[PDB]
Structures are given as structure tokens and as C-alpha cells.
Amino acid sequence: MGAPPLPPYSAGGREVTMKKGDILTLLNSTNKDWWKVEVNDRQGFVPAAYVKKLDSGTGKELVLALYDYQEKS
């Protein structure tokens, strides 16, 4: 809890629910605000500002969520 404000623009499509401490499979990071990952067998784009890559020394490209977020339109 206690995450920053969302960006002005938006990717434009379907997203994926993320929870604080969840490991989402990084797919695309072309954007510095929206990162496309896969969680709960679902692919979508989430705000990187809410999550944070996890590379302590494993090699695999995985990112951990910092703040809980849920799709809302």
C-alpha cells in the first residue's frame, strides 16, 4: 500500500491483477511506465511503478509486485 499516482496515458487493452509480493513473468518492458507481464495464467500490462524487478542472483527475468493493484475501467 502507498503507491504513486498512475500515468497520464495508458497502454490500451487488457491488464492483469497483481498483489504485493507476487511474482509476475516479465514479457515486455518497452515502456518505462507500463510493463507487460504474466500472472495467474493471465497476460497483461501493469504499472512498473507499482512493481519492481527481482534479480538477486538467479538470472531468470522475474519481477515482484510492491503494491496491490486491480483492473478498473
UniProtKB/Swiss-Prot annotation:
Coiled-coil stretches noted in the UniProt entry, renumbered to this chain: none
SH3 domain: residues covered: 14-73
Subcellular location(s) of the protein: Cytoplasm, Cytoskeleton; Cytoplasm, Cell cortex
Disulfides per UniProt: none
Biological function: Morphologically, spectrin-like proteins appear to be related to spectrin, showing a flexible rod-like structure. They can bind actin but seem to differ in their calmodulin-binding activity. In nonerythroid tissues, spectrins, in association with some other proteins, may play an important role in membrane organization.
Subunit structure: Like erythrocyte spectrin, the spectrin-like proteins are capable of forming dimers which can further associate to tetramers. Interacts with ACP1.
Sequence similarity: Belongs to the spectrin family.
Record protein name field: Spectrin alpha chain, non-erythrocytic 1
Origin organism lineage: Eukaryota, Metazoa, Chordata, Craniata, Vertebrata
Full protein: residues contained: 967 to 1025 of 2477
